[PDB]
């Protein structure tokens, strides 16, 4: 009997990490990352904003199979600049932009509530 | 309370031959008294 349910759909790695940090062997300074318990709702955002950054050279994510809530992501960039530093810069950009969005939303919501 | 038999709520409490044709009814088919034991469900 051993067919998985939806508990494993989003609960983070039980006896396991959140992510793998594995170096590619086909191009200089490339690293693949395996997130799990995530999907497009993450991955597209990270890829798009990381591509918006200029110092990177390649950024693309894929999900393997919709039966599994894991997905990969490949980053290479020019020398000196670490890909992990690129990723953490990207995350900082994301947190700061949508925190601003949140603020802005409560301001306008309170304004629209008349008086 | 062990058997039903009918539209009547005749709780026959049957051991043997206490007018299975229940007194208020006429029936002789003797339906069998859904349990008091506590049951579990799962509203997924």
């Amino acid at each position: 009997m051993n067919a998985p349910d939806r508990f494993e759909l989003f609960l983070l790695g039980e006896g396991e990490s959140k992510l793998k940090i594995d170096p590619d062997t086909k191009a200089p300074n490339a690293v693949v990352i395996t997130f799990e318990k995530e999907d497009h709702t993450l991955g597209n955002l990270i890829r798009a904003e990381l591509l918006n950054d200029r110092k990177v050279l390649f950024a693309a994510y894929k999900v393997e199979h919709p039966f599994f809530a894991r997905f990969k992501l490949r980053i290479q960039t020019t020398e000196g600049y670490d890909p992990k530093d690129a990723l953490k810069n990207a995350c900082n950009s994301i947190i700061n932009k949508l925190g601003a969005l949140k603020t802005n939303f409560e301001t306008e919501w309170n304004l629209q509530t008349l008086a | 309370l062990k058997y039903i038999c009918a539209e009547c709520s005749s709780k026959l409490s049957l051991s043997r031959t206490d007018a299975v044709r229940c007194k208020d009814c006429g029936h002789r088919i003797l339906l069998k008294a859904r349990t008091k034991r506590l049951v579990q469900f799962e509203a997924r």
């Binding site: 939806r6 508990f7 759909l9 989003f10 990490s17 959140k18 992510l19 940090i21 997130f35 497009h40 709702t41 993450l42 597209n44 955002l45 890829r47 798009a48 904003e49 918006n52 992990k84 990723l87 953490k88 995350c91 900082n92 994301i94 947190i95 932009k97 949508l98 925190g99 601003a100 969005l101 949140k102 603020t103 802005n104 939303f105 409560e106 306008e108 919501w109 304004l111 629209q112 | 709520s9 506590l38 049951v39 579990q40 469900f41 799962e42 509203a43 997924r44």
Partner: protein, 262 residues
């Protein structure tokens, strides 16, 4: 500061607004978070003490499971999951009870406004089933006549919309950008005219018409989105928008700290 926001109109149950100076993945991910990831409260497990009605037991379970519940104070308690307790302490769950009787000669309905909170509510605004109409009745559950009985013990838990549609607040969403197709992200199937054979967007007049003859503005990029959020009513709509932005950033910050800890 950054991503400006403009409110077109608002109500008790739906928000319609404008979002600018943002990128496409940003908006779309907000949409998906807001449709799938909001934590809430819903009834989850049910014990039939006694059923008699025509209506079947797992109908009673399933149709119970879909009644929306008051979830302003949802953040105060924690998952049954993560809870230090076992078997639904007050500090992870809430308990619901239903009573019915075939009293009248007529058929008697059982509305959602009959189930009552039993356990410690500990002063946090949780669990009262929403009554949307102006006639007191909640949503209909079951009907009875003169002899049927229901005795229900119910337990609600945290849950999120990803693993079941019970735990959704979302209920609908809308989304639109470039109503005039200036970005050329589509072209229209037609047989005489694209312009004649398609209805104009309602959001057309918010931007100018494409000025008819100017060349293809290739360097441009999508912005200025058009959202309409419409919650079911288990939680106010401003709360669902703000909580969705909050939980998305919580997710991203979590991945950041995991990376730094690695």
């Amino acid at each position: 500061e950054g991503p400006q926001v403009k409110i077109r109109e608002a109500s008790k149950d739906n928000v319609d607004f404008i979002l600018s100076n943002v990128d496409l993945a940003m908006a779309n991910s907000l949409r998906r978070v807001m449709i799938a990831e909001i934590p809430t409260l819903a009834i989850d497990s049910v014990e039939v003490e006694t059923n008699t009605t025509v209506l079947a037991d797992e109908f009673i379970a399933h149709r119970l499971g879909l009644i929306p519940l008051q979830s302003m104070d949802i953040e105060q308690l924690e998952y049954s999951r993560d809870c230090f307790c076992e078997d639904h302490c007050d500090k992870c769950s809430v308990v619901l009870t239903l009573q019915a009787f075939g009293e009248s000669e007529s058929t008697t309905n059982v509305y959602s406004k009959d189930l009552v909170i039993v356990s410690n509510l500990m002063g946090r605004n949780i669990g009262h089933p929403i009554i949307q109409d102006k006639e007191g009745n909640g949503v209909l559950i079951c009907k009875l006549r003169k002899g049927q009985e229901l005795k229900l013990t119910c337990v609600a838990k945290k849950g999120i919309a990803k693993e079941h549609a019970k735990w959704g607040p979302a209920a609908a969403i809308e989304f639109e950008y470039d109503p005039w197709n200036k970005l050329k992200h589509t072209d229209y199937w037609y047989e005489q005219d694209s312009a004649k054979e398609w209805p104009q967007s309602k959001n057309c007049e918010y931007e100018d018409p494409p000025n008819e003859g100017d060349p293809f503005d290739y360097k441009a990029q999508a912005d200025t989105f058009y959202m309409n959020v419409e919650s079911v009513g288990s939680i106010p709509v401003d709360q669902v928008v703000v909580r969705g932005i909050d939980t998305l950033q919580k997710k991203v910050a979590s991945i950041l700290l995991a990376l730094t800890q690695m």
